[model samples]
Target chain A: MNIVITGAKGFVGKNLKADLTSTTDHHIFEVHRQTKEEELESALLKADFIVHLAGVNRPEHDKEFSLGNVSYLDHVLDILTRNTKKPAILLSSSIQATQDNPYGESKLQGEQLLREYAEEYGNTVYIYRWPNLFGKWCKPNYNSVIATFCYKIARNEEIQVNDRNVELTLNYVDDIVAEIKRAIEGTPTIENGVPTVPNVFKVTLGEIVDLLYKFKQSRLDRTLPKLDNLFEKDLYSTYLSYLPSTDFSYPLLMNVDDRGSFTEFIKTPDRGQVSVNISKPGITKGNHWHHTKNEKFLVVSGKGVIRFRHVNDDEIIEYYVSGDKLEVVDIPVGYTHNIENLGDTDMVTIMWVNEMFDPNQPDTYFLEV
Target chain B: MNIVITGAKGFVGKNLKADLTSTTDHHIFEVHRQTKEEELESALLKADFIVHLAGVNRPEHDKEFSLGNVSYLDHVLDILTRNTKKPAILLSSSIQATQDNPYGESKLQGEQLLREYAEEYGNTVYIYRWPNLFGKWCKPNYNSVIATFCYKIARNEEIQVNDRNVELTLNYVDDIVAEIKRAIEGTPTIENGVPTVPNVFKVTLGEIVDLLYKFKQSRLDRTLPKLDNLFEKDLYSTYLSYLPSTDFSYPLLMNVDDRGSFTEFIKTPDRGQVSVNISKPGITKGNHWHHTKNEKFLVVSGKGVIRFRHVNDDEIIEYYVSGDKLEVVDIPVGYTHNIENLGDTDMVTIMWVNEMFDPNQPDTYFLEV
Candidate 1:
């Protein structure tokens, strides 16, 4: 199937085009700002489905809104009028279409044209009045407030939120693309006789700023915020996509000593903490017992022996571990345990504890096996 | 200071003795079942503080309760009467002392003996009527329901839960030990003129059973339940301590192929998921892009080149990574990325994703970098 995607360089258009190109075997004809009129005409003639995503948001002049959002769409309809086999169309409208604004008025006009054309041509037309949309590849510091905030926060730039309590309804671009794909497949999600994206998130401006700041701090603290909900997960992914290429890598603080180093990789309140332990040859670590703290140590590199002795008993149990076969040894409570690097090189172990270390109540008691 | 602890081989006695031995300078004199009467008398003579933790529950004969709880305390009091310098005592009473049961009657009699001894000798006595207590080293299938459940579940043995909705007020042995230490230091946690353990948890038998089952399932699923609260964290730690010595190690299912293996280590809803990826020399993996998923890749061993290309552009970026200097590279959305093992050995990379993989909505697209 030949799919014509207008404004293929724009945020929603690019996302939809990419998804369709990768997930489906349809031929995608991209109509961007640099594309000539002849190319658009040629693509429209062979189009089985047309996704109209071209629009001018925050234009230099009010007339440009009508020109890009409504006029350009009208031109596409004119080209399709000549084809005996009229292709179905999916129009990207705005949630603000009912409001009295230049962009909203243009979107409303575009919707009217599509509805009239569908009635006359007897072709299926799914019109979606999308809310504030955000995802990867959206232009930063442009029309999208979420995109601007994500971009500025990622680079340590200032972001302004005049009304912290103002709530914004947001829908992810991926969800919009999914709905558009469904429309192309003749199963558009219709809500109240209008096309819609099913999944939407409503969050206050202050809440978003607070989460963005925490996402920024996550780089240094190496701790993740609670992401059990889809809103937070999507926001975090968007923030990461805006990060500068130079800052893609971050250094973990390694607690270094003669026995090599121990670096904490990730810490979470609910899931515990993960750390990488590197011990020098013949070096032994952790001759201690915990009252309630427990750990799982995975010997990832080199050879070692994990020895455990019940604090009340004299019997010592030994488990020889090597990187040739990976296994996780659980450190139980009341056991004075230690790991000795038996190999000639450094032994690397990935350690996971049931809780983050609290100095005030360490629960650790030093005892030899 | 010399501290005399009766029933030192018992659950509470053992934990308290171990803690005091490791964290303080006091000498501990343990009076267990095997201790001669002379040993108890000798330790009493030199004691500055005494923690009497001995008690009988679920005995074959009801008379044993009075003999162990009341008559034993009377003997300790008779011995202390000869001493010119009286020592402070912390008696481990029961919450059921107010009830009419034989065990409760014995506990009430023991409390009365301690009260009279404290009034006459002018020595401090902290009488704590504790509820159901649990922690590491507690005898399973004997007294502690928690210990029994944990033990049976960890060993894949069947467990019976009668009266699932019955609520149990439980306190951790660690907290009790901490209170005992405070009492030894002349500061006991007094509640309404009665000693108490500060931290306690109240949970239904059904809730406990659900959690224990989930914990047992965690061994195979490699997922952790939320541990943001102290009760769950302590409970989880206790459950882990009960795992049989032979079952201290568990196997992780590794997805292996020519590229090597990928094994998930830990997963939690709020904290994301962690997996270890091993790539053979000269092998490249993950020429794919995600819509919303983001990841952190840490090369722990060997050398690799992580390359990335924006899905919308032709500019390719590269980062040289090696095991010598560990660094975590963030994989952002909308970028087709791949990691190539540049060394002659297997390259091990630790990958952390913000969300668990859902096959229904993978959000992944195959595209070359």
Candidate 2:
């Protein structure tokens, strides 16, 4: 099958091309900004399916909105109008089509032209009204507000958030791509009269800015902002792609001593924490008990002997471990415990606790093991 | 309905008793090792449901196996045989019943007696062929090897894991309870002749010890073992319940100075690392540019000003942030960036990078933003 995709050099176009090419056997014809008029004529002649994603919103002039959106759309329609092959058409529309604005009116015209083409020629048309589409490879300053905000802030620039209750509907590029994939297979979710991407996220402009700000501050706080909402998860992923390559790594504070080093790996709300513990050979670490906090110790490397004594009794118990066989030792409450490296090499242990460490009201008490 | 639970004080029995009582409206009658004859007779008198969990595995003598397994089962059968009101029964059998060993032969006898009673009286009987059962409140030294290992290690005791290829099939108590709940609700996974619990985990004793040891080492590694297997996840949870109170909280090395403190929160294999960055008011940190490192700046608390300049130009871009409006700023490569606390209070920022910070290949270069 021949799949011709318009705006092939655009963000969604590029990602879709890579994904579809890797997974499908169909030959793809890419129509980009640099493609000549003759190339479009040749590509559309043999196209079994058309993904018309060519449209513009951010333009230098108001008239460019019609030229970028409607003119490109007409170029495809002019070819499809006389086609007797009846290829499937998937047009990219905008949710703003209902509003009384120049960009919205232009997108509405593009949708109308495609619908009329489909009805007149009996070709299956999928007109998808997209929301704020976001993903990797999107232009920062020339795309959606999300793209602009992510790009500008990423480069240490600024963003303004007024007290307007401006709400936004977001459609992840992946979701739209999946819908396009479905259309290519001749099975799209057409509701009422138009193809739709089902999972749309609604958030106010204020909320988007607020969440983005929280993500920036997460560095020193060492806490991930709540990603209970799917929109936040997708947005965060999209935002990461805008990061500069040179700023890709950051240093973690590692505490080192004669006993070795300990660093917190991750902390999540309500789920507890994971930490790394390294102990020098012959060194004993931990001789304390927790009242409520509990832990599990996974010895990934080296050999060690862990000893424990009940906080109330002198009876001591012990276990010997080595890296040759993976084992996890659990540290229970009311037990004073100590792990000593008995082998020739340093012991590396991964620890998971029931809660993040809080120093103010530490539930830990020193005792002998 | 009145629910009679045998071996109510044992590990599986205790957990079942607590869970059943908390979730269901049925009144529970506990028949433990110390239950009097009058109470047993009274429990059976008006019981609507029965959970026969009483049985012995590790006995002082071989003859005691039959005494603990069959004798108790016969006792329940004799009582049910005389009763007119037939109650639903969920008997805890063992996989060892197929083996020709003494313990196996005895457990098989118990199953026979219960089957005969169910057939003769036309009562519903669910006989679960259990494996090595484990969960919280289990006796460490006596219940099962997993319980013994968890308890001994948590208490600083010695455990022997010789180089033997010993294999074990395990049945988590939660699974057993779920089956019991199904029996109570008259919905069980029954085959041609028997009811069953679907999920069973098979692992060698060597593998078990290896996993436990690795869990201990996870403390230093700051990573988690593969949790794709259900049994590993359950055992890890059970192991944590054995942790001593003082062992719950482990200290992390936080780098502190006039600018405040910074700590690495957590690191994942493919997603890079998250760190907590703190800055005192009026302090400026990070006069650096990276060639390949990229980061996201989430301002979680206080007010801050982040500035960036292209490495080749004097064009400085600045973004003002605070806790009032959450937003994230991206630190792209080729841009020298720094953040300064603009508020009166200490500022907290959460930072995430594309890759874990490696000391040997740190791409950061000193510069001015």
Candidate 3:
């Protein structure tokens, strides 16, 4: 089926273009900001369905809301009448349509006209009253606070929290398109003369801000927060892609000493921590034993001798490990152990522990091996 | 510090040896099952601390428990008394020592002998009364129900859950060794005069069985369970590592057509599914639009032209993508879309949708691009 979409240059429009062009075989009539009026008419004349997405969201004057949201809607209605095509229609409406605001009142006017056209001309019409929407491609600072916050914080810019506890129901851009397609397919769940997506996320303003802030802090901590839910994961992914080109890399803290240096690389609440350890020539580290913690150590550079003893045993087993023959040594429970740089240069080892360190329950006990 | 570990080749003993030998610089004197009486006495004499891990779980005869558990204790005490060197002692005891069974009786006898030796010689003694323990390197058929199930299932062998509802408190080998090390370092948490590891997991046989079975089935579904909980993640890792060397690879079902083949690679309960789409050269797929569902498409291995049109618009915007210039195109809502393989070879696209496919509410509408 041939389809026509207006506001084809807006956030939703760009995604619609990308989605449709990449995954489907349908012809798309894009009503871009630069398209000529006569060309739009010709596109409408040959269309089978019309997705009316064009509207002014960031107007310089209040009257523009009325003109763009209502007056322009009327122009589309007139064109549809003259086009002589029974194209299925889907209009993008605002969730604030019933509210007592200029924007809402103007959008409400457009909805009323669409319903009248559907009733008079027997044209199938789907009017969606979308809630606070989020996702990529949205213009930061001008669109939803979610997009603005994600963008500003990604660049280490400040964001104002007007109402910390205000709850917002978020409609992902992908979901909006999905729901629109469902309506066009005649499969949407319509309860009160509007279509709805099955899955939506509700979060407080403070909660979302805190999570976005944590996303920035993860680089410093060398750790990732537990992504226990779906919305946060998508939100973080959306927030990340909005960062400035040069703001991608974050530096790690390395601990240096006479024994070389050590740096924590990655940590997760469920999976534990990973750290890189380096030892200077003839230097030794880890004369400690744990009661419930164990680690696996891989020798990647230089040579080393790992030694362990049962708490009071007279024999010491030695493992001669080197970069030339990479080997992993498992540090088991109950035995005091240590690793010594046995080469002429520095020794490097990558270690994986079972849990993050807790100072209060620092299960590690020190003793000479 | 010099340490002596009895039963050095047993499950816990082996881990203790491996751990201490790889991570510490302490000396370890191992008194294995095959160690002669005279050599054990010499190792005991040179000890500073003794890890008494020597205990028989399964013996050829019932009297072996009496001989190995209780009688062996008498021999160790005799050697300790004869030694000129003083050493602290940590004995591996069992919670079953209080029960009225042959194994329990023998183990209780060992505990009594150790108490007497500690009192008479004033040597530091840490007695650990443990419940069921688990970890790798353990014999599947004899060591633990956990190891048995993991090994059997990994090998495609059937397992019997005799009492699925029976509860078991399990101590991880890592924790066991960590606690033992804490004991030797003289910082163990002791209650009722017994050392213990703070971390332990308790589960019914049925719950564990179901989890392992789900893990096996995960291969077929290309999905992973929600492993937000620590025990489940660790257990899953342990279970996977136990997979037979010959049974590591699993086959996935591919949906094939003239357009090529499509297969799901991975699915997570919370993260949605990932599928691979292959199209034969010159084929155009997807003329569908969604109302509330959309996807991300990446042309990874072939040249392709992606086109999109708003349902009733005449303008078509196209993105020329090729493997050499990899890019992801977003399929937005409201636009009818189609992708054509522009090369002579098969087209490969990786697609990521926000939600899993549900035939009940497909939300997709057909249109032409």
Candidate 4:
């Protein structure tokens, strides 16, 4: 199949083209702002489906709206008509199409022209009134508030918020692209009498700003936002995409001592924390017991002896662990336990605990096993 | 402080003694079923605080109830009186004291004896009507339903659930011990004129069984329970403690090929999944892109080159990573990415994704980076 994409340089267009190209075997023909007239005609004639994402909402003059949107669609429809092409068309309209602004008028006119073409040529047409769509590849400091906020926050730049309480109905660009893919498959969702991404998010500007700031601080605290919230997960992914390429990694706070080093890898409020511990040979660590906190220690490298002594009993339990046989030792409550590196080389252990450590209420007590 | 804990071999008694021993500089004396008369007398004479936890709710004969509860308390009080010791006594009573059963009668008599002793000797007395309790080291098939279920499920044995809807108010043993520690510190919660663990969980038998089964299955699936729910977290920890000593470790289902192995380490509903990927030298892995699924790849060992290409563009971006300087590379949406082992040794990488992979909707597309 031959898929034609207009406004190929726009946010939605780039995402759709990339996703469709990666997932399917169809040939994609792009018509961007610098596309030649002959290239547009060739693409229109060869297209099995046309995705019309080209439109100017932030033009310098009011007349440019009609020229970039309505007139551009008219030119494409004329090319298809002259080439006797009647491909299914998908029009990316905006929620503002129902408003009285000049940009909305142009979008309304474009929708009208597509419907007329479909009626005359017997070609299918799907028009979606997209809300504020946001994701990667979107231009910052432009029309998208989320993209601007993500970009500015990642760089520690100031972001303006006129009304913190103002709410926006935002849809992820990937979700919209998925809907477009479904439309290309000739199964557009018509249950609601309109085409739209169903998983739009409603959040206040203040809440989004709070989450973005938390995401930025997560690098320092090494904590993650709860990913069960789909919107938050998407937003976090978008925020990461905006990070400076040189700042992709951050150094962890390594608690180094005479014996070894211990560094936390990740921490989550609902999933505990992961830490990497390196122990020097003949060195022992953690002759401590916790009341409610439990842990699992996996010896990834070198040999060790993990010993546990029930606080009420004098008997000691020992687990001999080595890198040759990976095993996880469970640290149960009320048992004073410790791990001693028994090998000649350094020992590496991955430890996971049931809760993040709090300094005031550590629930930890020092007692040798 | 000299702390004396009766029923030293009992679940609550053992936890309290161990916790108190670990957290404070105190001498703990034991008086279990096998304790000699001389030991009891010596402990009573030297006690600064006594936590009386011994009781028999289930016995071969009804006469044993008084022998274990009421008569035993009388003997201890006689010794304390003879020695002229006025120590604080924390009696671990039962909620059954309010019911019209033989066990209730014995508990009520013991409470009366303790109050009389406290009034006569001018000593501090804290009586707690403890409900059902569960935690590590709890005996199975004897008293605690949670212990019995956890034991059976971990061993893959069939369990009987006569009334799944029967709700039980259960408290964790660690919480009870913490409160006991507070009582020993002269800061008991007497707002309601009663002593109790404040954070008790009310859950149905069916819910507990379901959770236990899920926890048992977690060894195979490698997924964790939602730890945000405090009861689930505590129950999970309890269940883990019941695992067979030899079965503390379970092998992950490693996806092994000629290149190397990829093994999933941990997964949670709200925290995604962590996987260990090992790539053989000169081998490449993951030439794919996703629409909504994003990931982070951290090179932990050996040297590698992580490359990313925006699916719409031909330009490729590369990041050199090595174990000498650990770094994490974020894989964003609409970008085809892959990692190539560039060194002579195997490259080990840790990958984390926001969602567990579901084969039916993987959202992955093959492409060259």
Candidate 5:
């Protein structure tokens, strides 16, 4: 298979070329600005796939945006449409295409134009709405939130998380590439111009922050001080109005049911909360385990240890948690476990499990040591 | 601060405890079931830091070794010692310790004893060691030639060299942990009761194979194709000879006279080799670059490239002869530019620059493109 990729010098293009070279015996021809029109035309004539990634992304000004996002895309689409033997076109679109931002609006227009051309030329068109793409080659100057946060935390600098309330979704570069590869292979079909198959995976902004924090801690030689205060001020501040008053018994609740039951709380749903007061000392909670729930937890404040027994075994696994962003432990159903708060300050966590609240499945299950 | 490591776990403990931890607060309290009165006295009285990682690394061995290694390590050392006012020990060893393998020699010994003592004395010890540590966790596994070959080939897989001629160096988990936080604190200053700084680094047979084989390939999924002929066995059989070959080329050189005359070869009086290779394709070579005389590169096989240009000003870096690995690329005193090979086979390399090849100096002066 012969594949011609525009913007060959770009990040995605370079990675695509490497991937194709490694996985398949496809002949790859890069179409750079230096490539002559005659060369492109000749290559296109022999090509089976044209991955159009030539347009500029996120220009600073309207003029730049018009020339880069609009004009360049127009040129590529015109060429593709005029081809005698039209090849399948994979147009890289941005998730911002649906957003109100100028860049997003222009990208949306590009997608529309490409769709129109596909209809007229009778060629296959695949539009990929990419979210955040990140890898080793990512530059700090680019407005990639992952890259930016990684860089900031790497340098021990503060990161401004805009909206803490809304869950932000992130797609890793590897996963995005996998989706693209799947599309190229034509595994999951599209129905009536809509992708019936799910291609995108979701990850919240908080999760992304946690991943970046972990990556930095593991890979780099720096330390990050606890930034709970900064995070609350920057990220949660915008949603403060939606939260309950400080004096409210259910202050952390984000939504309430009509029956006045605790419906959806800001804390992790489906998981038990073990709260510790800073004013008290030598107070420990949770030396038990859930028979069926696997818990995912992040330390909101302070530190402690969660001691648990391996399922059906006498072996014990104890993990120390503090200051660290997130720690995931899979306590198999029917495991014996307990947690003790050993810090001076108030320790709190928002944990999540697979099941909903059950009277039989109490928070603590006492077992003889 | 006087520190006591209750149960020195495995090879990892020996390496890391010797290198990374602070010597001022260091002591090893070998936990054995029959730990004498003196051992308990030494452990409880003066130790400031205790890393309880002692035991039998290989559990399936004779009961004597197991008792000495695992049972004694855990029960006696962890229990009898560690009853101190100082900080508790970090007691995690490798996953193999609990498994049914000879590799679990010390782990079971340490774990059994340590758990008993930790339970009895109510002291904490952090214990963990996973199988096959890589990247930041531990050094490359040298014993697993398959993995080592894979890694080497991946790093230099682009070079199209024959499968039989690649050589590599591998390291174990012990070396890796030594490089981490522990080694920095506990580097040994005395060897054999003599005042000598110990630099302990070890590599295995398999790691070298994986690294060398993986260096030139785009991916690591390639299996060792079966060649029916005894001349061509599996990848492992083919590359066994190459492992030792890496050790033979270091600190030795065939001197070249100014008049292009050959001088007698001189062997470097060293324990190990410190050199790397850059193999060539069939006929391609590199652009010229120069070093002060005595800059050496050995042609391992096939060919080499030695393109040269003027030392100063913007001169075009040109192509030169293609040399084989083990063949020296002796850059004369005044040459500069690129090297290339116009051969069908790979130009394997074993190169060495002078002790004073400083990048800070204008060592390489290439012509502006």
Candidate 6:
């Protein structure tokens, strides 16, 4: 599945590219903003699916918006409409389309133009209207509120607020990408699965603010306030008006920003169940030991130090981990062991394990220092 | 004049206590929440001023607000109202008092009760309504958004927003302390050296967010974006209503959040300014090392390491600094030097200078290691 992504240098584009790099056999073609007309044609021809994430949503004026967003989308659609074998094109739109701003108007215009082209040329297009997208590689500039807030929190500066009245929607970059990936993979089905028309997901601004706030608090080694009362009284009241009321089960899977807490185990199944790569700092592995689970560990990047303590004994065994080497440690029910990181950079280790974890019989057991 | 502060265990109280400890001749008294009637009476009799900052704001229910905020103030006022020599009382109020909530109502009630008691007993009473206060000792469990946000950001956690809306003011602990200090020193007088009700300074939530964002960005070695375009146009418009339109200034000597590109230096006449401790992680000696300006440096606290490198040369000179020792280094007009922290704790140094800095010269330079 060849997947082509445009505007690959932008914040969201870069994150999407990084996210899709390892998992799929999909060939990613990053279309730079300065790509020549001929280059775009050639790139489009070799693609099975084109995730068109180019064009500026927030240009200075109406003219810039038309040229950057509307006209740009028009140019891309023109190329796809003329194709002999039409490849699926995923158009990136903004939640601003429903908004009163010029950015939203331009995005809406772009969506309308794409739908018209799709109808005339029999082209399949999936238009994704995203809210504020946040994740790693997100800088503190105008990209998203989360990035801006993160930058402020990092500096230990005071965060100012205007009225506690305004609300907005936010979607994590990974979640947005996941939905896009799902849309791309389930393409060409048209009627039922593909739906032929674009689908819009409405997210609230408050949710994203809360997420960023929680993230910052966790970093500072703090617990977030109980939102049950706030949620019961207000959260659903306004959010349900814009978005569909789903179970929102994904929040449970999210690591609740615990600063310097126990090691965070992130499982990105879309990227090969878990393609581990530690990049951030202050992360360390367990010091004691774990038993009852047989684990297959693979070092993806950087260096790691692992120490295996003898079960029920004071003896200690240490080892250095690096490269693409796969190390397997099988702990028989009662054996105790743990791994420690001994590198300046991030040490990422991918673990594949069998059997569901039992809370009552957790593998962790303390060993004498 | 002696001063007694209740809830001295709190972050704000501790900072205020530290700030006043050496400067004022007033004896300090600590009044805990669990203090008995006899202990409270003994402390209250000797103190000239009482800063009542005890009690919880957000409790489990409306009953807790009454028990914590209302009852606590009543308990203190009960003793002061009956005494013949009533000490001037400074009652701490919450900004939430204006908002529609049980906590706000309780704070309002507490203030009214204090005012009634002051009138009945002819006692001087000043009520201070504090906004969100933040500093190093901020605890997650406490009623502080600053600590909560810091903790999350520190842990790299996702901040949660209620309905995607986050709006609140942030007042620095130092600034609050400064305001309290001024209020304490102020007296009842007419126009010539007039004393009036302490003014309340309004701060917006957006300003707090912007300050925090800038601080975090600085730590990451990134520059902050201009404030004019910080938030989206719609969000900004909404925020403008709540943010104060007029300039509000506090009497504090230092404006820590100032964003001026240029630094200004002032030379004292007759009196010498003392140096700050530099051995601490946050404190650094020679954060500004002058090249063109002639200066005198004296080590006051801990120890410092002075490093000087000649212009266009890699060769360096290192010197250890300690005690009330003074060193006169007649640096060549273009030579660069910086004081490195060398002690186990922060080193305080007193600097006497002969010339003020010129912005165009930029006498200081950072080394590339």
Lowest lDDT 10-mer window, candidate 6 chain A? A243-252
Number of backbone clashes in candidate 3: 72
Model 4: pairs clashing at backbone N, Cα or C within 3 Å: none
- C-alpha local distance difference test of each model: 0.86, 0.73, 0.73, 0.82, 0.45, 0.50
Candidate 2 wrong stretches, greater than 4 Å: A1-369, B56-70, B82-84, B191-193, B310-315, B324-330
Chain B, per-candidate TM-score: 0.94, 0.88, 0.77, 0.93, 0.37, 0.52
Per-residue accuracy of model 2 over B1-369 as CA lDDT, tens digit each: 988998888787776776666567899999877777777887887788888888743212266454533376677666766566788888888888999998889888888877887887887888888888776667777748888888777666879887548878888766887788888999998866678886788889888877777766665565554443667766666776666644543444467876787766545554455566778888999988654456777665578888888654687888877644445576765567999998886777767676667877575667777
Candidate 4 Cα lDDT to native = 0.82
True contacts kept of each: 0.77, 0.06, 0.03, 0.44, 0.00, 0.00
Candidate 5 lDDT over B1-369, as tens digits, reads 555544343444544444333222444444333546676666656655565444443233465662443343444354445455634555555646667886685565555665666687775554544344322111234454443444344334332234535443233332344333343254423345522222322334433333344322211221121222211222322232222211211121223222111111111211011232333353333343322212344433344455544333354443243321112233332344344444554333333333323456433433322
lDDT score at residue B133, model 5, on the 0-100 scale: 30
Runs in model 3 lying further than 4 Å from the true structure: A21-27, A30-47, A56-70, A191-194, A214-228, A245-369, B56-70, B82-86, B98-102, B191-194, B210-229, B233-369
TM-score of chain B of 2: 0.88
State the lDDT of candidate 2 residue by residue for A1-369, as single tens digits. 989999888878976886676557899999987788788888998988998887653212265454433377776778766666889888888888999898899889888877787787888877778887777667877847888888776677888667548987888876877788988887888777667887888888888887777666565565554444567766776666676654543444457887887766556554456566778888999988754466767664578887878654687888777544445566765467888998786666767676668887575667667
Of the two candidates 1 and 6, the one with more favorable lDDT, higher being better, is 1
Q: For residue A329, what is the lDDT in candidate 4?
A: 74
Per-model TM-score on C-alpha atoms: 0.95, 0.53, 0.66, 0.92, 0.31, 0.31
Docking class of 3: incorrect
Instruction: Please provide, for model 6 over B1-369, each residue's C-alpha lDDT reduced to its tens digit, 9 standing for 90 to 100.
Output: 778898776776765675566346678988775666687887877777888877743222265354433375666666665555668887778878798898888888888888788787887877766665555455664576555554554445565544323555555554566567766876432233523223223445445455544434432331212222322211221221121112110111221222111111112221111111223433443433332233334443356665555433576666666542323222222235566556564443334333333456443444431
lDDT of 5 by residue, A1-369 (tens): 788888776656765665566456889988876777788767777777788777654222355454433366676666665567677888778889989998899889888988888888887878877665554334555776655665566566798897745555444434444555666776534556654324344556776677556534422221112223222211211111111121101112122222111212211121122111121233454455442334444333357766665323586666676523333333333345655567764444334343444666253355532
Residues A204-263, candidate 3: write the lDDT tens digits: 999999999997787677555444475776676567556554343333456777778776
Error of model 2, residue B280, in angstroms: 2.3
Per-model chain A TM? 0.94, 0.91, 0.76, 0.94, 0.51, 0.53
Top lDDT prediction, candidate number: 1
Candidate 1 docking: what grade? medium
> Per-candidate DockQ versus the true complex?
0.74, 0.04, 0.07, 0.48, 0.01, 0.01
- Cα lDDT tens digits for candidate 4, B1-369: 788998888898877777776668899998888777787888889999988888744212365454533366777777888655578889988888999998888888889888987887888899988888999889999978999999999898999989999999888887898889889999887647777677889999999999999988876777777778999998988887787655666665668889987877788888888877878889999898887788877765678898888766797888888755545677777678899999997777778888899978788988877
TM-score, ranked from best to worst: 1, 4, 3, 2, 5, 6
